[PDB]
Each structure stands twice: as C-alpha cells, then as structure tokens.
Design an enzyme around this catalytic site. Structure first.
Site, PDB file in Angstrom:
ATOM      1  N   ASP A 139       0.917  -1.236  -0.041  1.00 35.53           N
ATOM      2  CA  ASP A 139       0.040  -0.160  -0.054  1.00 35.53           C
ATOM      3  C   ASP A 139       0.850   1.102  -0.113  1.00 35.53           C
ATOM      4  OD1 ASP A 139      -2.490   1.227  -0.046  1.00 35.53           O
ATOM      5  OD2 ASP A 139      -2.541   1.434   2.366  1.00 35.53           O
ATOM      6  N   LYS A 142       2.832   3.166  -5.591  1.00 34.71           N
ATOM      7  CA  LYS A 142       2.319   2.504  -6.776  1.00 34.71           C
ATOM      8  C   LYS A 142       3.594   1.858  -7.684  1.00 34.71           C
ATOM      9  CE  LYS A 142      -1.040   3.215  -4.099  1.00 34.71           C
ATOM     10  NZ  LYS A 142      -0.872   2.534  -2.865  1.00 34.71           N
ATOM     11  N   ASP A 167      -3.211  -3.277  -2.558  1.00 34.64           N
ATOM     12  CA  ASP A 167      -4.310  -2.107  -2.671  1.00 34.64           C
ATOM     13  C   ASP A 167      -4.033  -1.272  -4.132  1.00 34.64           C
ATOM     14  OD1 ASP A 167      -6.452  -0.751  -1.770  1.00 34.64           O
ATOM     15  OD2 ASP A 167      -5.244   0.857  -0.748  1.00 34.64           O
ATOM     16  N   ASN A 168      -5.148  -0.821  -4.416  1.00 40.50           N
ATOM     17  CA  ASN A 168      -5.230   0.392  -5.347  1.00 40.50           C
ATOM     18  C   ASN A 168      -4.777  -0.257  -6.738  1.00 40.50           C
ATOM     19  OD1 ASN A 168      -3.783   2.102  -2.773  1.00 40.50           O
ATOM     20  ND2 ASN A 168      -5.835   2.575  -3.513  1.00 40.50           N
ATOM     21  N   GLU A 197     -11.585   4.090  -1.293  1.00 37.35           N
ATOM     22  CA  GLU A 197     -11.893   4.594  -0.029  1.00 37.35           C
ATOM     23  C   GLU A 197     -12.763   5.673  -0.208  1.00 37.35           C
ATOM     24  OE1 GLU A 197      -8.836   3.754  -1.105  1.00 37.35           O
ATOM     25  OE2 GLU A 197      -7.355   5.293  -0.082  1.00 37.35           O
TER      26      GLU A 197
HETATM   27  O1  LIG Z   1      -0.420   6.895  -3.090  1.00 35.73           O
HETATM   28  C1  LIG Z   1      -0.966   6.263  -2.355  1.00 35.73           C
HETATM   29  N1  LIG Z   1      -0.328   5.417  -1.355  1.00 35.73           N
HETATM   30  C2  LIG Z   1       1.070   5.365  -1.191  1.00 35.73           C
HETATM   31  C3  LIG Z   1       1.195   6.749  -0.201  1.00 35.73           C
HETATM   32  C4  LIG Z   1       2.781   6.880  -0.211  1.00 35.73           C
HETATM   33  C5  LIG Z   1       3.584   5.903   0.244  1.00 35.73           C
HETATM   34  C6  LIG Z   1       5.192   6.178   0.260  1.00 35.73           C
HETATM   35  N2  LIG Z   1       5.764   5.167   1.073  1.00 35.73           N
HETATM   36  C7  LIG Z   1       5.618   4.424   2.338  1.00 35.73           C
HETATM   37  C8  LIG Z   1       6.461   3.396   2.512  1.00 35.73           C
HETATM   38  N3  LIG Z   1       7.385   3.582   1.652  1.00 35.73           N
HETATM   39  C9  LIG Z   1       6.880   4.280   0.594  1.00 35.73           C
HETATM   40  C10 LIG Z   1      -2.436   5.849  -2.472  1.00 35.73           C
HETATM   41  C11 LIG Z   1      -3.228   7.171  -3.133  1.00 35.73           C
HETATM   42  C12 LIG Z   1      -4.412   6.936  -3.448  1.00 35.73           C
HETATM   43  C13 LIG Z   1      -5.426   8.125  -4.305  1.00 35.73           C
HETATM   44  C14 LIG Z   1      -6.311   7.477  -4.827  1.00 35.73           C
HETATM   45  C15 LIG Z   1      -6.900   8.518  -5.751  1.00 35.73           C
HETATM   46  C16 LIG Z   1      -6.605   9.971  -5.728  1.00 35.73           C
HETATM   47  F1  LIG Z   1      -7.185  10.850  -6.595  1.00 35.73           F
HETATM   48  C17 LIG Z   1      -5.517   9.969  -5.108  1.00 35.73           C
HETATM   49  C18 LIG Z   1      -4.917   9.200  -4.374  1.00 35.73           C
HETATM   50  C19 LIG Z   1      -5.251   5.962  -2.801  1.00 35.73           C
HETATM   51  C20 LIG Z   1      -4.558   5.116  -1.867  1.00 35.73           C
HETATM   52  O2  LIG Z   1      -5.379   3.944  -1.237  1.00 35.73           O
HETATM   53  C21 LIG Z   1      -3.389   5.002  -1.713  1.00 35.73           C
HETATM   54  O3  LIG Z   1      -2.680   4.080  -0.928  1.00 35.73           O
HETATM   55  K   LIG Z   2      -4.372   2.559   5.552  1.00 41.54           K
HETATM   56 MG   LIG Z   3      -4.196   2.601  -0.583  1.00 45.26          MG
END
Ligand SMILES: O=C(NCCCCCn1ccnc1)c1cc(-c2ccc(F)cc2)cc(O)c1O
Ligand SMILES: [K+]
Ligand SMILES: [Mg+2]
Length: 213
Positions: A139, A142, A167-168, A197
């Site tokens: 998660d 991506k 996820d996603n 979500e």
């Molecule tokens: O970017 C996401 N997750 C990664 C966050 C950074 C992780 C960095 N990291 C942590 C540890 N090592 C590296 C994410 C985005 C969306 C979303 C969906 C629609 C939209 F319009 C905008 C955004 C929905 C999610 O469910 C997501 O998880």
């Molecule tokens: K979460």
């Molecule tokens: Mg997510």
C-alpha cells in the site's frame, strides 16, 4: 496542523482506548464527513478482513502505514502472538501510526520500521529475525509494488503460499505489478473488485499467492 494530526485527534476524542473496531469506525466517519484520506477504507477493508481470517497469518509485512488504519485492521484480527511489521518512509506518518496503534491497544503486535522499503527489506532476516513472510500488504508507492515484490523474492522472504494482497490496483493503479503477477507461473492471482476508500469510484485488491521458484 495536518490532516493526519486531525484524524488522530478525532480518533482520540471519538473512539474508546483499546477498542480497535471503534478506532476504525472513527477514522471512517472522519474521512466520509470531514476530509478524505488515503486509508484503505471500509469497503476494501471488509475484503482485507476476509483474507486475514482465511489465512490467519503469523507474520505480516505491510508496505506503507500512512495513519495506521490498515495496521489496526489487520492487527485486530491476528491470533495471540502473531505479528505485523509495517514500513513507513514518512516520519510524520510513522509517528501518527505509532500513536494510532497505541490508542487502539495494538502496540505489542505491531512494529513500525521507519525508512525506505528498498533499504529495510534486505535487513529483515539479519536485523529483524525474519525467516519467511506469511502475508504482505502492499500500500505504498504504486510504482514500487513490482520492484519490492521482486526484492522480497531475491531476499528469500517468500515461501510457497505467501499471500501478497495489493491495494489500489485500479486507482491510482499498479499496471506493471498486475501484468507481472497475472502473467507469472510463480503466482496464483485473484482480483477483488471494490471501491476507492470513501468514494463512488471503482478500485480493487489483488491477491497474488506465491508458488515458489
Ligand atoms: O499514494 C497512495 N499510497 C502511497 C502513499 C505514499 C507511500 C510512500 N511510502 C511508504 C512507505 N514506503 C513508501 C494512495 C493514493 C490513493 C489515491 C487515490 C485517488 C486519488 F485521486 C489520489 C490518491 C489511494 C490510496 O489507497 C493510496 O494508498
Ligand atoms: K491504511
Ligand atoms: Mg491504498
């Protein structure tokens, strides 16, 4: 004052300490009524719960903690003695996640690892006494799902039956990861269609069970 600090304050003031279900409900209420946030959410969360209950994993690795919503979701259903390790590169999010787990009373079951998954994954065996993983919840970035899955295999962290739950896979989407696992004889894949979500937007989870080299 950040959105993540607002979510944590809301939980502390609207949930019961030591009650993970009330913590999840408070985060979902806040994100539906006040401000959207990238927690896995209740729709995809119910699919996660069904997967966790089926496999009863003893050791889970999560890539990307955010506010600790998915860590609370998984950790609340783990058996006594089972553990979750969650990797979070953002120190401010790691601090929110630790406080969320502490409030939920799940701190003894979960370890937050602060840093980059590409740097932490090769340390799991020697530093964190890991043998193989029972499940992995992806998660984080991506574009990192595929490289980190290949890194977990290289490090000997996967075994026959390790469950990868991602996820996603639809939104924002993980096209290279999906094409790779669906085309590989080393994975048995299942797609669980659901919703982003807190939104009427289609998203989904992919389960990819590792079958060995
Ligand atoms: O970017 C996401 N997750 C990664 C966050 C950074 C992780 C960095 N990291 C942590 C540890 N090592 C590296 C994410 C985005 C969306 C979303 C969906 C629609 C939209 F319009 C905008 C955004 C929905 C999610 O469910 C997501 O998880
Ligand atoms: K979460
Ligand atoms: Mg997510």
């Amino acid at each position: 004052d950040t959105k993540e600090q607002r979510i944590l304050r809301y939980v502390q003031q609207n949930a019961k300490p030591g009650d993970p279900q009330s913590v999840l409900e408070a985060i979902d209420t806040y994100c539906t009524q006040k401000e959207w946030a990238m927690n896995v959410g209740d729709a995809k969360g119910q699919i996660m719960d069904a997967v966790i209950r089926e496999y009863s994993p003893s050791l889970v690795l999560e890539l990307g903690a955010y506010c600790g919503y998915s860590a609370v979701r998984m950790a609340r259903l783990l058996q006594p003695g089972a553990r979750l390790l969650t990797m979070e590169m953002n120190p401010d999010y790691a601090a929110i996640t630790q406080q969320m787990l502490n409030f939920a009373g799940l701190q003894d079951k979960v370890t937050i690892l602060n840093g980059a998954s590409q740097d932490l994954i090769p340390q799991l065996k020697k530093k964190y006494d890991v043998d193989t993983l029972d499940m992995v919840f992806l998660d984080h970035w991506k574009d990192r799902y595929l490289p980190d899955t290949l890194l977990l295999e290289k490090c000997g962290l996967l075994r026959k039956g390790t469950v990868l739950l991602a996820d996603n896979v639809i939104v924002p989407g993980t096209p290279d990861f999906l094409a790779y696992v669906r085309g590989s004889s080393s994975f048995e894949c299942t797609h669980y269609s659901s919703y982003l979500e807190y939104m009427k937007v289609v998203d989904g989870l992919e389960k990819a069970i590792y079958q060995g080299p």
